[PDB]
Enzyme design. Structure first.
Site, PDB file in Angstrom:
ATOM      1  N   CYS A  54      -8.170  -9.668   1.160  1.00  0.00           N
ATOM      2  CA  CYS A  54      -8.919  -9.572   2.280  1.00  0.00           C
ATOM      3  C   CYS A  54     -10.036  -8.599   2.414  1.00  0.00           C
ATOM      4  O   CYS A  54     -10.051  -7.933   1.452  1.00  0.00           O
ATOM      5  CB  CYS A  54      -7.704  -9.389   3.620  1.00  0.00           C
ATOM      6  N   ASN A  84     -12.107 -11.922  -9.597  1.00  0.00           N
ATOM      7  CA  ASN A  84     -10.631 -12.021  -9.917  1.00  0.00           C
ATOM      8  C   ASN A  84     -10.038 -12.811 -11.219  1.00  0.00           C
ATOM      9  O   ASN A  84      -9.391 -12.188 -11.951  1.00  0.00           O
ATOM     10  CB  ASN A  84      -9.714 -12.222  -8.837  1.00  0.00           C
ATOM     11  N   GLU A 115       0.780  -1.190   0.043  1.00  0.00           N
ATOM     12  CA  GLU A 115       0.005  -0.052   0.125  1.00  0.00           C
ATOM     13  C   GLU A 115       0.657   1.182  -0.097  1.00  0.00           C
ATOM     14  O   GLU A 115       0.964   2.028   0.893  1.00  0.00           O
ATOM     15  CB  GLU A 115      -0.972  -0.175   1.208  1.00  0.00           C
ATOM     16  N   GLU A 151      -3.285  -9.197  -1.335  1.00  0.00           N
ATOM     17  CA  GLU A 151      -4.080  -8.935  -0.217  1.00  0.00           C
ATOM     18  C   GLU A 151      -5.315  -8.990  -0.569  1.00  0.00           C
ATOM     19  O   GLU A 151      -6.153  -7.977  -0.467  1.00  0.00           O
ATOM     20  CB  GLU A 151      -3.612  -7.668   0.416  1.00  0.00           C
TER      21      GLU A 151
END
Ligand SMILES: *[C@@H]1O[C@H](CO)[C@@H](O[C@@H]2O[C@H](CO)[C@@H](O)[C@H](O)[C@H]2NC(C)=O)[C@H](O)[C@H]1NC(C)=O
Ligand SMILES: *[C@@H]1O[C@H](CO)[C@@H](O)[C@H](O)[C@H]1NC(C)=O
Length: 497
Positions: free
Chosen positions: A342, A370, A235, A340
């Site tokens: 999540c 995805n 990030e 990630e």
């Protein structure tokens, strides 16, 4: 071998209770006969990757939806599935009694588990740590003589990573991400908040940071661990926001572009770890395609970039087509990867919801979305958390597929764990995503893939309440008559030949 011991904690579905002597496991997977298909079913009502089998018939009985496989239409090859070995995860796993620890690990990595083959490793501390620390906190050690691994790595993470691999039937790939640099390399001299590396690419701040990666890799090598890839920064966009609460290091695209080109790229290449792959972004998908435009249209940067890492947190604010699709269009030979994978939050739900089918469904629906847009692999966030969603030194926001109740020496496997399994277990590295043509508009989510041994795997997710009668046609084999029961996820597997 062992079925799931259900427990309810008041939410839409059950967790599977595992402890020191008992955890739900699978038998070795069987290669069943042509004309026969395997089905693994999980349902909100409480079935967990339950194995049944049936016939693929050469005639077609249905009037309903027809998902037709199309082995010719060929898309991305799958890198793999995994999760992150964060300080917090390592810490919850290590808090169970050794036998329990292994049932947990076997759960994720063993063929009796869901056969994870990726593990993300944060490089030093992040929000899922009990303390802010880097591998070189001694200020103005540009040479990095004091660089070293804390106990977090040598006693928690590295030992488990070993054990994970020992237990795994697949070869597992390690991915590393840094959150922050030593604060002395930073413009604001703090582990969080807005601030970047000092000066700009090429300089001593950037060269050092680049060297950090190599030292990081060097250190894990002494402990006999190789990395498949690192991310240029976890990030990066976050380090640009005033008063961001956790470990970060801001890069704008151009900044990342030049850091990769001038420093990280070369230094990696110039090392004994030149084979390690570099992934960029490692951030929210909304920053695509722009981020990729900026890094990849510079040849000297892009020569060093094997792929683009993305996160799932902020996806509601960017559809796949406009982000991942357009990015693949522009950059076909730069793989897209989800590092990630999540979520499991809101404003008003707590961090951990024991047995929430809804978060399970978000996971699989996200994995499918995805895969339908060229993504090659996934790394879930923390491998394990406590019931509070911790420990997090800032604030617990996320769920995790496994929850550790340290006081009871037991751990719980969330619907999520099984929603990842419906993929991680049956889509080994090498699998290619193939076409799958629905015959009519429908409410399901479906993806087809071809196992490296030539055989087929189809995941079908019913996120609605209604059972949906279903037919999967494989022109090489015939037809699977089936129903997809409302609030279910199914993995269908069959030989084609
Ligand atoms: C770990 O979980 C298992 C399974 O839930 C527990 O063993 C069960 O005990 C209950 C009640 O005593 C019985 O109904 C089952 O027959 C047991 N399962 C078996 C033998 O397969 C076990 O007690 C748990 N471990 C601890 C320490 O509580
Ligand atoms: C390494 O780190 C410590 C901080 O404990 C510092 O005081 C020490 O002088 C450093 N380097 C050397 C050369 O000892």
């Amino acid at each position: 071998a062992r079925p799931c011991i259900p427990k309810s904690f008041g939410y839409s579905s059950v967790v599977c209770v595992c402890n020191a002597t008992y955890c739900d496991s699978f038998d070795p997977p069987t290669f069943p006969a042509l004309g026969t298909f395997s089905r693994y079913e999980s349902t909100r009502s409480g079935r967990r990757m339950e194995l049944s089998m049936g016939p693929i018939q050469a005639n077609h009985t249905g009037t309903g939806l027809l998902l037709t496989l199309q082995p010719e239409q060929k898309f991305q090859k799958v890198k793999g599935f995994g999760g992150a070995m964060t300080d917090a995860a390592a810490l919850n796993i290590l808090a169970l009694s050794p036998p329990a620890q292994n049932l947990l690990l076997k759960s994720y990595f063993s063929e009796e588990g869901i056969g994870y083959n990726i593990i993300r490793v944060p490089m030093a501390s992040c929000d899922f740590s009990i303390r802010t620390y880097t591998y070189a906190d001694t200020p103005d050690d540009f040479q990095l003589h004091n660089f070293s691994l804390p106990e977090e790595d040598t006693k928690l993470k590295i030992p488990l990573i070993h054990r994970a691999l020992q237990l795994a039937q697949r070869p597992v790939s390690l991915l590393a991400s840094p959150w922050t640099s030593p604060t002395w390399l930073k413009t604001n001299g703090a582990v969080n908040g807005k601030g970047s590396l000092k000066g700009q690419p090429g300089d001593i701040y950037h060269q050092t940071w680049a060297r950090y990666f190599v030292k990081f890799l060097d250190a894990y090598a002494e402990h006999k661990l190789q990395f498949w890839a690192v991310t240029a920064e976890n990030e990066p966009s976050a380090g640009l926001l005033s008063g961001y609460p956790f470990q970060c290091l801001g890069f704008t695209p151009e900044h990342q572009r030049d850091f990769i080109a001038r420093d990280l790229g070369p230094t990696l290449a110039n090392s004994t770890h030149h084979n390690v792959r570099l992934l960029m972004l490692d951030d929210q998908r909304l920053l695509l395609p722009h981020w990729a435009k900026v890094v990849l249209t510079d040849p000297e940067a892009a020569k060093y970039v094997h792929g683009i890492a993305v996160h799932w947190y902020l996806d509601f604010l960017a559809p796949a087509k406009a982000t991942l699709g357009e990015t693949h269009r522009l950059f076909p030979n730069t793989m897209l990867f989800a590092s990630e994978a999540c979520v499991g939050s809101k404003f008003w739900e707590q961090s951990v919801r024991l047995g929430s089918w809804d978060r399970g469904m978000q996971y699989s629906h996200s994995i499918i979305t995805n895969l339908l847009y060229h993504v090659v692999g996934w790394t879930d966030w923390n491998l394990a958390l406590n019931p509070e969603g911790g420990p997090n030194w800032v604030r617990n926001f996320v769920d995790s597929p496994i929850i550790v109740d340290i006081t009871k020496d037991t751990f719980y496997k969330q619907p999520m764990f099984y929603h990842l399994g419906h993929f991680s277990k049956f889509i080994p590295e090498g699998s290619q995503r193939v076409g799958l043509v629905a015959s009519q508009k429908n409410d399901l989510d479906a993806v087809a893939l071809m196992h490296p041994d030539g055989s087929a795997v189809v995941v079908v997710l019913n996120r609605s309440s209604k059972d949906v009668p279903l037919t999967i046609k494989d022109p090489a084999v015939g037809f699977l008559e089936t129903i997809s029961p409302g609030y279910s996820i199914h993995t269908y597997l069959w030989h084609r030949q």
